[PDB]
Amino acid sequence: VVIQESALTTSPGGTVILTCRSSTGTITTSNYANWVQKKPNHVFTGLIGATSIRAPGVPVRFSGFLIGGKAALTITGAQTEDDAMYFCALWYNTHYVFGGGTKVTVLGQPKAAPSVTLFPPSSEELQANKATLVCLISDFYPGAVTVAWKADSSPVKAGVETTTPSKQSNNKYAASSYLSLTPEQWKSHRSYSCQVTHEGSTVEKTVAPTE
Amino acid sequence: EVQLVESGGGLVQPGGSLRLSCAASGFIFSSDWMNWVRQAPGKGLEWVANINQDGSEKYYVDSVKGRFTISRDNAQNSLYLQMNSLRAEDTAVYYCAKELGPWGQGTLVTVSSASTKGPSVFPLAPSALGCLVKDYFPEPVTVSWNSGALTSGVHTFPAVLQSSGLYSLSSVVTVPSSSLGTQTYICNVNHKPSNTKVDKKVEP
Ligand SMILES: CN1[C@H]2CC[C@@H]1[C@@H](C(=O)O)[C@@H](OC(=O)c1ccccc1)C2
């Protein structure tokens, strides 16, 4: 088992040190520690291999070495472009084993209120005797968000499917939430609402079969 | 620039076979070990196999020995993974990977006896506007707007896995209200596993 810390944060220009731990007890140079970076919307990329060897295009602010039986990845003067997930992999003579991954977050990106747009069921879907409500949330930072649905003024849990917030190409997050209903259920309420909670503030959007 | 492109991933019943390939470029392919790495949905990264610079050394993870074979051509820049007697646990995105450099984007491998289901495409009329790609299996689905003319203002969300077992995603555009009456907006949905190619006129 390869153990990594869950999350680390730093400001731009700050320093961060990633720890990779082996449940067997110790990591040596014969475990060929490999550090893999994953940004959202970018492919995985191997930054460090065999404990300390850097990939040709990685900057030298990244370094890997072994400290006290643990493999370590240090970022000296971290950058906003370093906001990503970092995985550690160890070699045990015949195979690699990956760790759970450590999320590194670089502070400085300002807060962003979520933009919420709720779509009612189409006329084309209602004709096929199906009904789906689509709640689209975009352009919010940070990525923590809470989605609650309301039929009339009462909450709804059955039929709700929500995606995990993922980063767009402009570094802000986005999410979607679906409420599949029957056509009889859709016209039997005066309205339906998607309320989105972000940083203690709640944005509410409402649709109705009226329109 | 190093580039690895995977292909060959699809849907097969438990017990079937499939062969993955990876086209390498941008570096001397025969001078590096090559790896196959997979990730099942929700689970973590799982190393599968690696191969020597000339094929004289190969290693496999335990859950895979006796069923998979790794090989490399050293005259066409290609890495291969032959997968036999596939099991439900082998469902994952498979990555072509090296110790140093970018991995490939990955190709989805789905081992399931569920049959392929094409999506339904419904217009999300405005009062932003978009389209809804409902109930399909397996992944993925591509979406474009007016034959890929527009690239900004459009956002296609990652798909959600329904309680059913099927997938759904949406893609929305933001346009001026004055553009609604003059300009057209057609979203182009293409689900290759089911041979589903639909263009829907999204309309107020
Ligand atoms: C058995 N091999 C395999 C697995 C462990 C060990 C190691 C090795 O051979 O050095 C690996 O390769 C690296 O770690 C490496 C290669 C190129 C650049 C940087 C690092 C390849």
Q: Where would I find the H helices in chain B?
A: 177-182
Query: Which of B48, B57, B65, B157 should be substituted to probe chain A, the one whose Cβ sees the most A Cβ atoms within 10 Å?
Result: B157
Q: Using the beta-carbon criterion (under 8 Å), do A211 and B100 form an inter-chain contact?
A: no
Q: Using the beta-carbon criterion (under 8 Å), do A136 and B130 form an inter-chain contact?
A: yes
For residue A146, which amino acid is it?
T
Q: CA-to-CA distance for A55 and A50, rounded, in angstroms?
A: 11
Tell me the sheet residues that pair with A43.
Answer: none
Experimental method: X-ray
Contact call for residues A137 and A116 (beta carbons, < 8 A): yes
The angle formed by the CA atoms of residues B186, B188 and B193, to the nearest 5 degrees, is 160
In chain A the domains, ranked by start, together with CATH numbers, are 1-108 (no CATH), 109-211 (2.60.40.10)
Q: State in words which class domain B114-204 has.
A: mainly beta
DSSP E strands, chain B: 3-7, 11-12, 18-25, 34-39, 45-51, 58-60, 68-73, 78-83, 92-97, 101-102, 107-111, 120-124, 129-136, 142-145, 154-156, 160-161, 167-173, 186-191, 196-201
Q: Using the beta-carbon criterion (under 8 Å), do B103 and A50 form an inter-chain contact?
A: no
Nearest to A99 by CA among A15, A10, A31: A31
| Angstrom distances, CA of residue B108 to CA of A12, B7, B62, B152 | 36, 9, 21, 27
Q: CA-to-CA distance for A121 and A16, rounded, in angstroms?
A: 48
Q: CA-to-CA distance for A27 and A33, rounded, in angstroms?
A: 8
Burial of B68 (0-12, 13-18, 19+ CB in 10 A): buried
State the pairing for strand pair A102-106/A7-10: parallel
Burial of A146 (0-12, 13-18, 19+ CB in 10 A): exposed
State the pairing for strand pair B68-73/B78-83: antiparallel
* Domain residue ranges in chain B: 1-113, 114-204
Q: CA-to-CA distance for B81 and B49, rounded, in angstroms?
A: 9
Q: CA-to-CA distance for A148 and A70, rounded, in angstroms?
A: 43
Enter the DSSP assignment of B117: B
Compute the CA torsion angle B101, A167, A120, A159 (nearest 10 deg): 80
State the pairing for strand pair A34-38/A84-91: antiparallel
This structure's resolution (angstroms)? Answer: 2.6
| Angstrom distances, CA of residue A129 to CA of A29, A200, A210, B203 | 63, 38, 18, 20
B-chain CB neighbours of A132 within 8 Å are 122, 132, 134, 168
A-chain CB neighbours of B105 within 8 Å are 43
- Is the CB of residue B160 less than 8 Å away from at least one CB of chain A? yes
A-chain CB neighbours of B161 within 8 Å are 161
Nearest to B15 by CA among B84, B116, B110, B91: B84
Alpha carbon B143 to chain centroid, angstroms: 14
Q: How far is the CA of B48 from the centre of ligand 1 (A)?
A: 15
Tell me the sheet residues that pair with B144.
Answer: B188
SS (H, E, C) chain A: CEEECCEEEECCCCEEEEEEEECCCCCCHHHCCEEEEECCCCCCEEEEECCCEECCCCCCCEEEEEECCEEEEEEECCCHHHCEEEEEEEECCCCEEEECCEEEEECCCCCECCEEEEECCCHHHHHCCCEEEEEEEEEEECCCCEEEEEECCEEECCCEEECCCEECCCCCEEEEEEEEECHHHHHCCCCEEEEEEECCEEEEEEECCCC
Tokens of B5: 């492109």
Contact call for residues A116 and A203 (beta carbons, < 8 A): yes
- Is the CB of residue B80 less than 8 Å away from at least one CB of chain A? no
Tell me the sheet residues that pair with B24.
Answer: B4
**SS3 call for B94:** strand
State the pairing for strand pair A131-140/A173-181: antiparallel
Q: Provide the greatest CA pair distance for chain A.
A: 69
**SS3 call for B63:** helix
Q: CA-to-CA distance for A20 and A88, rounded, in angstroms?
A: 6
Cis amide bond preceding B14, omega within 30: no
Q: How far is the CA of A101 from the centre of ligand 1 (A)?
A: 21
